[PDB]
Write a protein that holds these residues in place. Structure first.
Motif, PDB file in Angstrom:
ATOM      1  N   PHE E  11       0.829  -1.203   0.000  1.00 53.56           N
ATOM      2  CA  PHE E  11       0.000   0.000   0.000  1.00 53.56           C
ATOM      3  C   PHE E  11       0.870   1.261   0.000  1.00 53.56           C
ATOM      4  O   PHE E  11       0.715   2.093  -0.885  1.00 53.56           O
ATOM      5  CB  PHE E  11      -1.023  -0.013   1.140  1.00 53.56           C
ATOM      6  CG  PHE E  11      -2.125  -1.001   0.906  1.00 53.56           C
ATOM      7  CD1 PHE E  11      -1.924  -2.350   1.123  1.00 53.56           C
ATOM      8  CD2 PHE E  11      -3.330  -0.591   0.369  1.00 53.56           C
ATOM      9  CE1 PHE E  11      -2.926  -3.270   0.855  1.00 53.56           C
ATOM     10  CE2 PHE E  11      -4.334  -1.509   0.096  1.00 53.56           C
ATOM     11  CZ  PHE E  11      -4.131  -2.847   0.344  1.00 53.56           C
ATOM     12  N   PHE E  12       1.752   1.431   0.984  1.00 52.25           N
ATOM     13  CA  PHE E  12       2.638   2.581   1.020  1.00 52.25           C
ATOM     14  C   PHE E  12       4.090   2.126   1.090  1.00 52.25           C
ATOM     15  O   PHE E  12       4.504   1.531   2.079  1.00 52.25           O
ATOM     16  CB  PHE E  12       2.343   3.453   2.238  1.00 52.25           C
ATOM     17  CG  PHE E  12       0.962   4.025   2.267  1.00 52.25           C
ATOM     18  CD1 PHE E  12      -0.087   3.291   2.786  1.00 52.25           C
ATOM     19  CD2 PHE E  12       0.706   5.265   1.709  1.00 52.25           C
ATOM     20  CE1 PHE E  12      -1.374   3.812   2.791  1.00 52.25           C
ATOM     21  CE2 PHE E  12      -0.581   5.779   1.696  1.00 52.25           C
ATOM     22  CZ  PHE E  12      -1.618   5.052   2.247  1.00 52.25           C
ATOM     23  N   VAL E  16       5.949   8.154   5.492  1.00 53.88           N
ATOM     24  CA  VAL E  16       4.699   8.865   5.714  1.00 53.88           C
ATOM     25  C   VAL E  16       4.896   9.845   6.865  1.00 53.88           C
ATOM     26  O   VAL E  16       4.648   9.509   8.017  1.00 53.88           O
ATOM     27  CB  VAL E  16       3.554   7.874   5.984  1.00 53.88           C
ATOM     28  CG1 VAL E  16       2.263   8.570   6.382  1.00 53.88           C
ATOM     29  CG2 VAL E  16       3.330   6.991   4.770  1.00 53.88           C
ATOM     30  N   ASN E  19       1.773  13.479   9.162  1.00 55.92           N
ATOM     31  CA  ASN E  19       0.353  13.382   8.878  1.00 55.92           C
ATOM     32  C   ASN E  19      -0.380  14.206   9.923  1.00 55.92           C
ATOM     33  O   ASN E  19      -0.091  14.081  11.106  1.00 55.92           O
ATOM     34  CB  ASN E  19      -0.149  11.931   8.858  1.00 55.92           C
ATOM     35  CG  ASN E  19      -1.660  11.782   8.766  1.00 55.92           C
ATOM     36  OD1 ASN E  19      -2.277  12.149   7.768  1.00 55.92           O
ATOM     37  ND2 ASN E  19      -2.282  11.240   9.802  1.00 55.92           N
ATOM     38  N   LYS E  20      -1.316  15.039   9.468  1.00 55.64           N
ATOM     39  CA  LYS E  20      -2.291  15.635  10.361  1.00 55.64           C
ATOM     40  C   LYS E  20      -3.704  15.264   9.933  1.00 55.64           C
ATOM     41  O   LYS E  20      -4.651  15.783  10.522  1.00 55.64           O
ATOM     42  CB  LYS E  20      -2.118  17.157  10.408  1.00 55.64           C
ATOM     43  CG  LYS E  20      -0.683  17.619  10.612  1.00 55.64           C
ATOM     44  CD  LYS E  20      -0.545  19.085  10.918  1.00 55.64           C
ATOM     45  CE  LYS E  20       0.915  19.501  10.978  1.00 55.64           C
ATOM     46  NZ  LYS E  20       1.077  20.940  11.315  1.00 55.64           N
ATOM     47  N   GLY E  21      -3.858  14.351   8.964  1.00 58.13           N
ATOM     48  CA  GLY E  21      -5.174  13.939   8.486  1.00 58.13           C
ATOM     49  C   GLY E  21      -5.457  12.461   8.719  1.00 58.13           C
ATOM     50  O   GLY E  21      -5.211  11.956   9.807  1.00 58.13           O
ATOM     51  N   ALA E  22      -5.964  11.782   7.688  1.00 60.82           N
ATOM     52  CA  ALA E  22      -6.250  10.353   7.740  1.00 60.82           C
ATOM     53  C   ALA E  22      -5.491   9.635   6.630  1.00 60.82           C
ATOM     54  O   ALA E  22      -5.688   9.976   5.474  1.00 60.82           O
ATOM     55  CB  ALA E  22      -7.734  10.181   7.579  1.00 60.82           C
ATOM     56  N   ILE E  23      -4.603   8.691   6.953  1.00 60.38           N
ATOM     57  CA  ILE E  23      -4.036   7.789   5.954  1.00 60.38           C
ATOM     58  C   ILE E  23      -4.636   6.405   6.186  1.00 60.38           C
ATOM     59  O   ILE E  23      -4.569   5.907   7.301  1.00 60.38           O
ATOM     60  CB  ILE E  23      -2.507   7.704   6.064  1.00 60.38           C
ATOM     61  CG1 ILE E  23      -1.794   9.040   6.261  1.00 60.38           C
ATOM     62  CG2 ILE E  23      -1.941   6.961   4.883  1.00 60.38           C
ATOM     63  CD1 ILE E  23      -1.988   9.965   5.173  1.00 60.38           C
ATOM     64  N   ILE E  24      -5.208   5.773   5.162  1.00 61.18           N
ATOM     65  CA  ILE E  24      -5.809   4.451   5.312  1.00 61.18           C
ATOM     66  C   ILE E  24      -5.426   3.565   4.134  1.00 61.18           C
ATOM     67  O   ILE E  24      -5.417   4.000   2.988  1.00 61.18           O
ATOM     68  CB  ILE E  24      -7.341   4.550   5.389  1.00 61.18           C
ATOM     69  CG1 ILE E  24      -7.811   5.489   6.501  1.00 61.18           C
ATOM     70  CG2 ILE E  24      -7.950   3.159   5.498  1.00 61.18           C
ATOM     71  CD1 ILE E  24      -9.312   5.736   6.473  1.00 61.18           C
ATOM     72  N   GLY E  25      -5.139   2.308   4.402  1.00 62.19           N
ATOM     73  CA  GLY E  25      -4.680   1.441   3.337  1.00 62.19           C
ATOM     74  C   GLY E  25      -5.860   0.906   2.544  1.00 62.19           C
ATOM     75  O   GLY E  25      -5.949   1.110   1.341  1.00 62.19           O
ATOM     76  N   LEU E  26      -6.750   0.217   3.256  1.00 58.84           N
ATOM     77  CA  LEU E  26      -7.904  -0.435   2.670  1.00 58.84           C
ATOM     78  C   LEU E  26      -9.089  -0.190   3.590  1.00 58.84           C
ATOM     79  O   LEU E  26      -9.004  -0.478   4.772  1.00 58.84           O
ATOM     80  CB  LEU E  26      -7.540  -1.908   2.523  1.00 58.84           C
ATOM     81  CG  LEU E  26      -8.696  -2.891   2.398  1.00 58.84           C
ATOM     82  CD1 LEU E  26      -9.642  -2.488   1.292  1.00 58.84           C
ATOM     83  CD2 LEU E  26      -8.121  -4.265   2.121  1.00 58.84           C
ATOM     84  N   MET E  27     -10.151   0.408   3.064  1.00 59.11           N
ATOM     85  CA  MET E  27     -11.311   0.797   3.846  1.00 59.11           C
ATOM     86  C   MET E  27     -12.553   0.133   3.245  1.00 59.11           C
ATOM     87  O   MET E  27     -12.799   0.279   2.050  1.00 59.11           O
ATOM     88  CB  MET E  27     -11.452   2.317   3.779  1.00 59.11           C
ATOM     89  CG  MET E  27     -12.622   2.818   4.534  1.00 59.11           C
ATOM     90  SD  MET E  27     -12.744   4.622   4.567  1.00 59.11           S
ATOM     91  CE  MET E  27     -13.999   4.871   3.316  1.00 59.11           C
ATOM     92  N   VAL E  32     -15.056   8.525   6.691  1.00 62.33           N
ATOM     93  CA  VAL E  32     -13.901   9.317   7.093  1.00 62.33           C
ATOM     94  C   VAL E  32     -14.213  10.810   7.007  1.00 62.33           C
ATOM     95  O   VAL E  32     -14.621  11.298   5.960  1.00 62.33           O
ATOM     96  CB  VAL E  32     -12.686   9.009   6.211  1.00 62.33           C
ATOM     97  CG1 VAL E  32     -11.550   9.955   6.545  1.00 62.33           C
ATOM     98  CG2 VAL E  32     -12.263   7.560   6.334  1.00 62.33           C
ATOM     99  N   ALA E  34     -12.195  14.324   7.336  1.00 59.12           N
ATOM    100  CA  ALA E  34     -10.936  15.035   7.500  1.00 59.12           C
ATOM    101  C   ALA E  34     -11.072  16.467   6.951  1.00 59.12           C
ATOM    102  O   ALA E  34     -11.742  17.282   7.638  1.00 59.12           O
ATOM    103  CB  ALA E  34      -9.823  14.252   6.841  1.00 59.12           C
TER     104      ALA E  34
END
Lengths: 34, 34, 34, 34, 34, 34
Positions: E11-12, E16, E19-27, E32, E34
């Protein structure tokens, strides 16, 4: 304003009878032998 | 404002009768032999 | 304003009878042998 | 014969420094507020 | 014969940072903000 | 004979710096507000 509602997601919506193999909804990586 | 509600997710929504194999909802990695 | 509602997604919407192979909804990576 | 080997799956493969939010690998259902 | 090997999924693949938001691999399902 | 090997899949292959929003690899169903 924002309203988000009533989203629906379904993998199998009816009967799953007499399986002799592999039924899978969501597969990430991985190996299936049937 | 934000309202988020009534989201619905379903893998199998009806009967699962007489399985002789593998039924799986969500599989991450892993091996299935059937 | 924004309203978003009543979105519907379905992989299998009717009966899945007498599988002897592989039924999969969503597959990411991975190998299937049937 | 069948041989299956050396499959590799990785969500984050390098450094994750100074997060002030949400990092998630795999999320099923559920709500994130950031 | 069948040989299946050395499949790779990522995925990544690098850093990384901050981050101040949302990192997601698989949702799957889910909301969400943000 | 069959040989299958060295398949590669990558969502993000370099650095993900200073996110203040939403980064997602694979999203199935679900709502994002940014």
């Amino acid at each position: 304003g924002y309203e988000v509602h009533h989203q629906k997601l379904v993998f199998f919506a009816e009967d799953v009878g007499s399986n002799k193999g592999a039924i899978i909804g969501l597969m990430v990586g991985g190996v299936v032998i049937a």
